[PDB]
Amino acid sequence: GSSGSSGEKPYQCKECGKSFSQRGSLAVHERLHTGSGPSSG
Numbered sequence: 001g002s003s004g005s006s007g008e009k010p011y012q013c014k015e016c017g018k019s020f021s022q023r024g025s026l027a028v029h030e031r032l033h034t035g036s037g038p039s040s041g
C-alpha cells in the first residue's frame with residue numbers, strides 16, 4: 001500500500017521527458033543528450 005503523491009518540477013526535458021530541480025542540472029542533461037548517450041546508452 002502506497003501513501004505518497006508525486007509533485008512536479010520547475011524544469012523538464014523536452015527530448016525524453018525528464019525533470020530536474022536546478023536550471024544547471026537540466027542543462028547538463030540537455031547537452032549530454034548528443035553523442036552516445038540519448039538516454040541510457
Ligand SMILES: [Zn+2]
Pocket residue numbers: 013014015016017018029030033
Ligand atoms: Zn532528456
